[PDB]
Design a protein around this ligand. Structure first.
Ligand code: HEM
Ligand code: HEM
Ligand code: HEM
Ligand code: HEM
Lengths: 140, 143, 143, 140
């Protein structure tokens, strides 16, 4: 699915993102909620205002899931099984929303990593997120 | 599609700062790299065998300008995107047979390029406004 | 959207033979079974724990009639699908927050149901005509 | 990805389709070309008229690929690797077209298997074809 170069590229971007991972995940969430308001109905009990502690806390969770995915990139189905169960079965998250958040995660990296977000790395990150999304919708 | 005054303000201010000689080419180029099936529509453009090849390709850059030209025209006519893109629609749909989903992808790539170029300035509100715009263009093209 | 006279003929003739008490329910039911995230929008409908449960569910069947009602209204106004679905659009988009892709899916499920019901009579030309129709409805709903 | 019930359901439908497999594949192709004319540009050198020998011959190939996929349902990536290479790398088939042909394959089964195309079997066939499609676009 992912090439060795992809895996290399994704690892590199992760590395540069560093300890901002949580903050960037929260920003991606905000971007999604603002750009694609239909997504907000999955978070009725969240306060989704700017600077929300709940969005921040959640952004960190996302980021950590994604980090666990790159850390186990050759076995994402296994690594992400509980999250796949959660999203498809329990939350019944519409598969289209994964492309929306993936896009906002790309936008968020782009706006923060001038040097790292090259065309090649862009392509690798997109494939990485599509693979994560496939796993998280795989209980469909 | 209708942007609020603040939405219109967010789009307009940023678009003034766009290098119209380059951003188009970066967006088309990235599309061809990120979604490589789109390369099928540009076999006449020469070397597309590497990312560097695509990005440096003079024809990609040249053609990107026209795209961005159309996008700029789109921003100028938000209330009549249908009529504005009428001819481009016939071209892509009836002559080129490009699937409309690819318009959405190019729009989203453009947004990634704007984010890359403007960093922090490409705020979540600014992004939300641009997504409205690229959605409008895509749907206009798809009519 | 414009159907050719033959396209219109293909759609109209078949639609006359449709059991409007049942086909709607089969389509909605199948949508909920085939694309189970759509069940999130119908938690008030009771038992949706099995395919048999969904299909036999009186509320699914009842609601399917309304859908099909809207589709029939759509066929009657092919040239003004926009205005026709105006209110249903506000409902699904602004109150229900259903993603528009799901309109396309329901349309395609409907097509599968028609094929199931009419077999050989649901010829590739007839199908092509109906795809135009369900695409038009979906886009009208998505405005 | 596919449940045991899915695998059971897909096997059953295949069984009932029987030796019509080739003919049904050709019909699905025709349905796609008529319903979604953009797909025809992948077959410029085909004659795509009704009753075309080329569409028939091709429908059999499709059918045989799908049969090989159900016959090796627990290892479709391996079974379909050459076809994945062909579609993504060589033919550069737009991923969206796989959903179009999948839909027409469902429609074709529906129009031919009154008894077998139940809601449950419908759901299983859809998942099966989405999985085949994922593999065939996996070189993206
Ligand atoms: C694309 C990558 C995604 C990743 C990596 C991801 C990851 C996560 C994680 C780690 C959690 C916390 C689970 C827990 O605490 O047990 C979570 C919860 C959740 N996710 Fe996502 N998710 C993704 C996509 C989405 C999308 C697209 C949606 C819908 C728009 C969504 C909706 C939710 C909801 C509603 C919750 C539960 C929130 C709560 O009740 O606290 N997720 N996700
Ligand atoms: C989504 C927004 C898009 C815009 C605004 C746009 C705009 C344009 C413009 C302005 C031209 C030149 C027209 C002319 O020469 O008169 C063009 C040509 C072309 N476009 Fe795009 N396009 C879009 C999407 C796409 C996509 C996604 C593809 C393929 C994946 C595509 C494929 C082509 C091809 C093959 C040409 C040939 C140029 C020619 O024959 O002159 N277009 N487009
Ligand atoms: C694509 C074509 C569709 C049509 C023609 C359609 C039509 C309708 C109609 C006629 C109603 C009843 C309106 C009323 O009570 O006044 C309705 C309600 C509703 N629809 Fe659909 N719909 C479509 C797609 C969808 C999809 C895909 C979903 C969810 C996955 C959905 C979710 C709902 C919900 C939750 C209601 C609530 C009923 C109520 O509050 O009265 N719709 N729709
Ligand atoms: C969804 C399931 C699909 C299956 C199982 C499938 C299977 C096959 C097979 C078995 C072949 C023959 C390969 C060979 O002889 O070496 C083939 C070729 C081909 N396929 Fe598909 N395919 C699928 C989807 C698609 C789609 C969606 C498109 C584009 C609309 C497409 C376009 C083509 C083209 C253009 C060829 C080459 C035809 C030729 O030059 O003779 N395929 N495919």
């Amino acid at each position: 699915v992912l090439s060795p170069a992809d895996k290399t590229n994704v690892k590199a971007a992760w590395g540069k993102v560093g300890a901002h991972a949580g903050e960037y995940g929260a920003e991606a969430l905000e971007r999604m909620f603002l750009s694609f308001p239909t997504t907000k109905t999955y978070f009725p009990h969240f306060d989704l205002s700017h600077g929300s502690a709940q969005v921040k806390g959640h952004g960190k969770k996302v980021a950590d899931a994604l980090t666990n995915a790159v850390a186990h990139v050759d076995d994402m189905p296994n690594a992400l099984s509980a999250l796949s169960d959660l999203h498809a079965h329990k939350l019944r998250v519409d598969p289209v929303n994964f492309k929306l958040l993936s896009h906002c995660l790309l936008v968020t990296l782009a706006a923060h990593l001038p040097a790292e977000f090259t065309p090649a790395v862009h392509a690798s990150l997109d494939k990485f997120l599509a693979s994560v999304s496939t796993v998280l919708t795989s209980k469909y | 599609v209708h942007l609020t005054p603040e939405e219109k303000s967010a789009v307009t201010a940023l678009w003034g700062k766009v290098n119209v000689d380059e951003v188009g080419g970066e967006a088309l180029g990235r599309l061809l790299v990120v979604y490589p099936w789109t390369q099928r529509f540009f076999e006449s453009f020469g070397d597309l065998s590497t990312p560097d090849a695509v990005m440096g390709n003079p024809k990609v850059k040249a053609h990107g300008k026209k795209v961005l030209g159309a996008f700029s025209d789109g921003l100028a006519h938000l209330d009549n995107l249908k009529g504005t893109f009428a001819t481009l629609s016939e071209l892509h749909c009836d002559k080129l047979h490009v699937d409309p989903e690819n318009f959405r992808l190019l729009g989203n790539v453009l947004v990634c390029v704007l984010a890359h170029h403007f960093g922090k300035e490409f705020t979540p509100p600014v992004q939300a406004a641009y997504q409205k715009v690229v959605a409008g263009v895509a749907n206009a093209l798809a009519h």
